[PDB]
Amino acid sequence: NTQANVADAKSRIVDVDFAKETSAMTKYQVLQQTGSAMLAQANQLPQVALSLLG
Amino acid sequence: NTQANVADAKSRIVDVDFAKETSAMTKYQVLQQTGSAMLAQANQLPQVALSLLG
């Protein structure tokens, strides 16, 4: 009996909850694609200087 | 385990960060076109001497 209850206590501390973890993993995937598009588009900001005659 | 951690340490030293590198590459492309227009236009500065009667 006591072995089962200690296993309960030990899992709440070191084990992951997939419901919590899966949401976070999908959460950051969107942020990565958002970050890549923003960075690529922000890199060509200085090309405005070429419009004003070199 | 130790192999993975050494791979971490080795990549921070010799490997490029594309975020850093891509910005620099686009950074210099603009400067090249700016430099070419300035140099071409600076080359025809001495043509003012032809206005004052040869």
Q: From which experimental method does this structure derive?
A: cryo-EM
Residue B23 carries which side chain, given as an amino acid letter?
Answer: S
Residue B41 burial class via C-beta count within 10 angstroms: exposed 0-12, middle 13-18, buried 19 and up: exposed
DSSP H/E element including A41? helix A18-43
On whether any CB of chain B is under 8 Å from the CB of A32, the answer is: no
Is B31 in contact with A46 (CB distance < 8 Å)?
no
A39, A44, A49: residue with CB nearest B34: A49
State the Cα–Cα distance between residues A43 and B23, nearest whole angstrom: 6
- Chain centroid to Cα A2, Å, comes to 39
Number of neighbouring beta carbons within 10 Å of residue A37: 10
Residue located via tokens 């040869």: B54
Residues of A in contact with B23 (CB under 8 A): 43
Mutate to test the interface with A, among B17, B18, B23, B31 (most CBs of A within 10 A): B23
Helices (H) and strands (E) in chain B, counts: 2, 0
| Chain B nearest C-alpha distance from A54 (Å) | 5
Is A43 in contact with B22 (CB distance < 8 Å)?
yes
State the Cα–Cα distance between residues B27 and A46, nearest whole angstrom: 8
Q: Residue A44 contacts by C-beta under 8 Å, 6 or more apart in sequence? A: B26
